[PDB]
Design a protein around this ligand. Structure first.
Ligand SMILES: Cc1cc2nc3c(=O)[nH]c(=O)nc-3n(C[C@H](O)[C@H](O)[C@H](O)COP(=O)(O)O)c2cc1C
Ligand code: SF4
Ligand code: SF4
Ligand code: SF4
Ligand code: FES
Ligand SMILES: [Zn+2]
Lengths: 692, 117, 123, 240
């Protein structure tokens, strides 16, 4: 199954049929290259990885020469060094003198390999000189300066293969080849800010971080991404009080090197409309105030309203830390009221599936497991919008294999190919009985994705009844070695909120609250909170939700605090704090820990390690960071989630709606940024975006 | 004239010193910090001091807009930024500008606009 | 394990209040080199109040935290752990993440599609 | 497969392999259509034997050379992608693969482009380099970035705006393209430049001395001491 060869005297064994550059990477031998990438197709454009191979007359390209047995490879031949100096000089004679103005100064692949392998001096000194390429306006997110392009096809290969946006290409012969849309067509996709980390030269670069900073100045910090379902890995670059950019570090399970558009360009709204001090409402006007003023106003209004029980609502929101939910849940339950709800519509009740048995609300196959799939179906979701990295996974596995898709819900424009089934629960049950009982029962590794948008529907339990009966009846979708019922969760908090038990009881959904606590919780409507109620909004920047409050309290956002976050798969991951909270904002659990002291509650923790001990008391899979466990309770959980809504909910004929109205402005940071604000208008249906 | 110094107290500076420069009234960057914000932030130390002997050196965004636009017959317009009375290498590195789109394309070092004709 | 925190001259507040992190630096998404991804860095988590703040005067990034610039390199993971608990520090350790090996062929790019093409390569 | 080697296939299956194998030498067997063009007296297309002398090829079936055998400056067997044979070599050379590979050249398509002595070789090979700049697909970087440089150097060498060393330079920038490409178009665009430098170095030196004493001396890249970049374009130098 493996092949043993020799590079640089080193003897190496590698799986059969691989590329030669993978054998050089396995043996530790450093080979320079410009048009090779791990997540992309092989092209032999840049001619940089030439290598001396015995039984070959010419130096062969190491990226596309397949591995054969008995192979003797040398990389330190004088001919190979001459070849690298030659090809490097050839690259540099039409590449413009833009290094003081290029955005990739200390980051340029062309530049660091020109010291190490290229020629000292340059002989390019014609009077006619270099060519010049016209600038090409693509979109508002990507600055495009194509004189300094080397035609590595890497952006084109990517937007063809993985992003599913075929608008990029290469039109021309000779030097008059260009890389852009031919018509000056605007490029959309849900991850278009990923082509600008991909280009090795700075021809495709960042537009809001156009000329702001510079990589030897930046301090890098490895954190976790909120405002995403999957909770992808990032890399925060900070000047020290400001945050410059996020940029994906690799993890083959959660994001596979590729990160959302909305995750990337929301650093603009991190710093534009923030809360830096507490504000107390006087009546039609806020005033800002002292801490003792705000927190004692909270204590005095508690003593004035006196909610004795089931009247202190505490609803959390889209992005929160797990530890702030520990703080809030402990404060409300030592208060004596589990009116402890989540933000979404139909968040006032238990969400039609069990807080019991973690496999009820989690993505139960691994995110690595979707690569192994045969025929999968989704209900009520658009995975192109929500968890846009999962769309890259689905299209990638659909491209490599024989995969079969249909969809139940709104007519989605996928990158990949869906089949349509309908817009009705009756269309659902008809499609489960008619065609896809046979398909999902036939298939080895199928799965079923359930959107959390239909969890927020009031007719939720009919869908969960039908799908639980189908998963329990079919032994292929649910067996020992893998699990096939799967759900997606829109926000990064909802999986952690369901781990901790942050959900209301049946008694708590009946009463109207006298005092409401918004921790985050931006998508509340005006009608959701009572008019007599004393609401307080703890959150990091001003929003819809801050406008309704009688007191606001600034908190640290996800950059400014170290935090546990739980994704759809169930991974607990820590964000490292890059900068500190500006002005007067504090961390989110410390504020609740201090507001408790002015009430009758002394929370048993007071330090950061005791929060971790209390968090291990809630569940010890939240101190066990970045591990995934299986579930032995997969059989019992589907039955226990079948028994509940059996006959309790009748399926109404309301059509299945789209979960999010736009992609770009869905939480408190993305709605504050001007980048999403001028992005959503430019990524609305125009003639520049119509394929025609 | 009268700007509020964080207390309701009006402070009064002449109108020739609220300009960013005597070329240009307004700001040329999204974080340029207009002069009224500057005198609002630390007027504690503009006390007893002459405003006229402060520098105020001729904003350059307006001195480049009034330069004419060069016209090039060919496709590519090549640029030094150099003087040719000076014995040496002055100016910026040579860059080559494509003039094909409608309008006039600027040099990214010097800002001199070039147009194809 | 010997305890050298009293003989290094470091204050007590550094050993009792500050948590530190051992990590291998991630491979950068921008450029394709991997040279800075071998040594284990030691770096201190920031303090909420003491990190950085803008000067009233000019806009200088002024700090009160003094370990923010210090960062160590170690050869192995075990050497970093041994030194970190030898100096008496509370550490968190972050496990590295390598890429999964997947076999690539250039001849994959144009294999015969019996049914729907479902893709157009371009090269 | 080529259209000719398929169009030969039925008759060679009928007449047999032993009849076809008699013509030519031991490894280079058979016959071939020759397209004799350029500046001969009578341009033609014949079909004759392999391994035949070039003099008996040009003299017996295409009139002769326009001006006689004294009037032979060079010959290109095959297409554009073949180095030039000079005058003393091409007297006793055979038209197979072996006797042209031995003189570091190719038979190619066996087009015979002779070059008149009153014509210039430098203008010819400048036109060949412009052909390869126009016809390259532009995918790999040494071929695409190379034939633009070869054209910028051959225009300059046709005018004469160079130093004596820059044609040793042009030899090296042939060698760096020559074998690092996807197809053999970079290999093809290397070879005529190499044949020019191997066979007609004093013909280039004469043009360069001519430029050096008509007008002023010249630095590297064609720059003259008057040449300065004014607004827009470059003046002071006559822009080849
Ligand atoms: C740039 C380039 C252009 C070529 N043009 C031709 C052509 O026009 N006619 C032809 O018969 N072979 C041409 N060839 C050679 C082809 O590769 C040829 O079909 C093959 O190598 C040999 O075919 P054969 O066995 O019939 O000789 C060309 C090769 C290259 C690299
Ligand atoms: S990308 Fe090119 S122009 Fe920009 S800094 Fe690197 S080498 Fe210079
Ligand atoms: S646009 Fe960028 S990534 Fe695409 S081929 Fe050009 S330099 Fe490479
Ligand atoms: S040698 Fe051929 S394939 Fe390679 S760049 Fe030149 S024309 Fe394209
Ligand atoms: S990377 Fe192998 S040739 Fe471009
Ligand atoms: Zn300039």
């Amino acid at each position: 199954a493996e092949i043993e060869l020799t590079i640089d005297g080193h003897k190496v064994s590698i799986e059969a049929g691989s590329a030669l550059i993978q054998a050089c990477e396995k043996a530790g031998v450093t080979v320079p290259r410009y048009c090779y990438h791990d997540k992309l197709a092989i092209a032999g454009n840049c001619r940089m990885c030439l290598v001396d191979v015995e039984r070959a007359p010419k130096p062969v390209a190491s990226c596309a020469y397949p591995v054969a047995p008995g192979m003797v490879v040398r990389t330190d031949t004088e001919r190979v060094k001459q070849a690298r100096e030659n090809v490097m000089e050839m690259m540099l004679q039409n590449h413009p003198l833009d290094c003081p103005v290029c955005d990739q100064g200390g980051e340029c692949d062309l530049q660091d390999q020109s010291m190490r392998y290229g020629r000292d001096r340059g002989r390019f000194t014609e009077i006619t000189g270099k060519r010049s390429t016209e600038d090409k306006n693509i979109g508002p997110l990507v600055k495009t300066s194509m004189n300094r392009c080397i035609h590595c096809t890497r952006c084109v290969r990517f937007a063809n293969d993985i992003a599913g946006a075929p608008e990029l290409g290469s039109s021309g012969r000779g030097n008059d080849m260009q890389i852009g849309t031919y018509l000056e067509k605007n490029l959309n996709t849900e991850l278009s800010g990923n082509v600008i980390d991909l280009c090795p030269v700075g021809a495709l670069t960042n537009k809001p971080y156009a000329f702001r900073a510079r990589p030897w100045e930046l301090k890098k910090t490895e954190s976790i991404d909120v405002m995403d379902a999957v909770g992808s890995n990032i890399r925060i670059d900070s000047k020290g009080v400001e945050v410059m950019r996020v940029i994906p570090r690799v993890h083959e399970d959660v994001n596979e090197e590729w990160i959302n558009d909305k995750s990337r360009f929301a650093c603009d709204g991190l710093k534009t409309q923030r809360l830096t001090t507490p504000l107390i409402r006087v009546g039609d006007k806020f005033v800002n105030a002292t801490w003792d003023d705000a927190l004692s106003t909270i204590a005095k209004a508690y003593q004035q309203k006196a909610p004795k029980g089931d009247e202190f609502k505490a609803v959390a929101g889209a992005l929160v830390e797990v530890e702030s939910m520990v703080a809030l849940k402990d404060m409300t339950n030592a208060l004596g009221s589990e009116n402890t709800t989540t933000d979404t519509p139909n968040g006032n009740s238990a969400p039609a599936h069990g807080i019991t048995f973690r496999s009820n609300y989690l993505f139960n196959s691994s995110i690595a497991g979707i690569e192994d799939a045969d025929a999968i179906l989704l209900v009520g979701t658009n995975p192109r919008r929500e968890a846009a990295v999962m769309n890259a996974r689905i299209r990638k596995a659909w491209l490599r294999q024989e995969l079969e898709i249909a969809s139940v819900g709104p007519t989605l424009d996928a990158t990949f190919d869906v089949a349509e089934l309908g817009n009705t629960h009756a269309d659902l049950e008809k499609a489960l009985s008619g065609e896809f009982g046979e398909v999902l029962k036939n298939a080895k590794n199928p799965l079923i994705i359930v959107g959390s948008g239909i969890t927020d529907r009031e007719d939720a339990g009919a869908f969960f009844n039908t799908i639980g009966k189908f998963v329990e009846s079919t032994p292929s979708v649910l067996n020992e070695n893998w699990n096939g019922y799967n759900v997606l969760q829109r926000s990064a908090s909802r999986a952690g909120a369901y781990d901790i038990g942050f959900t209301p009881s049946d008694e708590a959904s009946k009463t109207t609250p006298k005092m409401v606590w918004l921790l985050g919780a931006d998508e509340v409507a005006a009608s959701d909170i009572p008019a007599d109620a004393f609401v307080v909004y703890q959150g990091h920047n001003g929003d819809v939700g801050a406008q309704f409050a009688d007191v606001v309290l600034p908190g640290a956002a996800y950059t400014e605090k170290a935090g546990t976050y739980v994704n759809t798969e169930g991974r607990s991951q820590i964000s490292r704090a890059a900068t500190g909270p500006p002005g007067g904002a504090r961390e989110d659990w410390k504020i609740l820990r201090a507001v408790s002291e002015y009430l009758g509650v002394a929370l048993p923790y007071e330090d950061a390690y005791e929060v971790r001990d209390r968090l291990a008391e809630i569940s010890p899979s939240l101190v066990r960071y970045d591990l995934v466990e299986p579930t032995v309770f997969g059989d019992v959980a589907v039955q226990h989630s079948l028994v509940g809504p059996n006959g309790s909910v009748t399926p109404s004929s309301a059509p299945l709606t789209e979960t999010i109205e736009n992609f770009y402005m869905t939480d408190s940071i993305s709605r504050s940024s001007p980048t999403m604000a001028k992005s959503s208008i430019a990524f609305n249906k125009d003639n520049k975006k119509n394929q025609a | 004239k009268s700007i509020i110094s964080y207390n309701g107290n009006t402070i009064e500076i002449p109108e020739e010193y609220t300009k960013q420069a005597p070329n240009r009234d307004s700001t040329w960057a999204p974080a340029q910090a207009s002069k009224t914000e500057i005198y609002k932030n630390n007027m504690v130390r503009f006390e007893q001091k002459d405003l006229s002997k402060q520098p105020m050196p001729y904003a350059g965004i307006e001195l480049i807009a009034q330069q004419p636009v060069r016209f090039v017959h060919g496709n590519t317009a090549v640029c030094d930024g150099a003087n040719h009375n000076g014995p040496g290498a002055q100016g910026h590195p040579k860059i080559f500008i494509n003039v094909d789109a409608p309008g006039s394309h600027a040099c990214q070092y010097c800002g001199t606009r070039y147009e194809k004709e | 394990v010997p305890a050298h925190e009293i003989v290094s001259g470091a204050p007590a507040e550094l050993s009792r209040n500050r948590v530190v992190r051992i990590y291998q630096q991630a491979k950068p998404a921008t450029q394709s080199g991997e040279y800075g991804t071998f040594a284990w860095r030691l770096d201190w988590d920031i303090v909420d109040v003491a990190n950085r703040w803008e000067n009233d005067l000019i806009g200088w990034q002024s700090s009160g935290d003094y370990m923010q610039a210090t960062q160590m390199k170690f050869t192995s993971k075990e050497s970093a752990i041994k030194f970190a608990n030898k100096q008496g520090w509370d550490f968190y350790i972050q496990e590295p993440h390598h890429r999964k090996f997947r076999v690539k062929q250039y001849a994959n790019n144009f294999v015969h599609s019996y049914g729907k093409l479902k893709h157009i390569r371009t090269k | 497969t080529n259209v000719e080697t398929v169009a030969v296939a039925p008759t060679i299956l009928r007449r047999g392999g032993d009849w076809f194998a008699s013509f030519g030498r031991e490894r280079n067997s058979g016959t071939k259509l020759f397209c004799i063009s350029g500046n001969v007296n009578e341009p033609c297309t014949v079909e004759e034997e392999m391994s035949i002398p070039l003099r008996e090829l040009l003299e017996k079936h295409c009139g002769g050379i326009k001006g006689g055998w004294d009037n032979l400056l060079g010959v290109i067997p095959g297409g554009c992608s073949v180095p030039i044979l000079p005058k003393n070599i091409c007297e006793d050379v055979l038209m197979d693969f072996d006797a042209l590979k031995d003189v570091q050249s190719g038979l190619g398509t066996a087009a015979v482009i002779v070059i008149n002595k009153q014509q210039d070789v430098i203008r010819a090979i400048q036109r060949f380099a412009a052909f390869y700049k126009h016809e390259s697909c532009g995918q790999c970087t040494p071929c695409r970035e190379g034939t633009t440089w070869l054209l910028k150097a051959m225009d300059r060498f046709r005018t004469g705006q160079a130093k004596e060393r820059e044609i040793d330079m042009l030899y090296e920038l042939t060698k760096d393209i020559e074998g690092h490409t996807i197809c053999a178009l970079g290999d093809a665009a290397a070879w005529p430049i190499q044949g020019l430098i191997r066979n007609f170095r004093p013909e280039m030196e004469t043009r360069m001395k001519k430029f050096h004493d008509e007008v002023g001396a010249v630095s590297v890249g064609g720059w003259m001491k008057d040449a300065r970049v004014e607004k827009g374009k470059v003046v002071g130098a006559p822009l080849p």
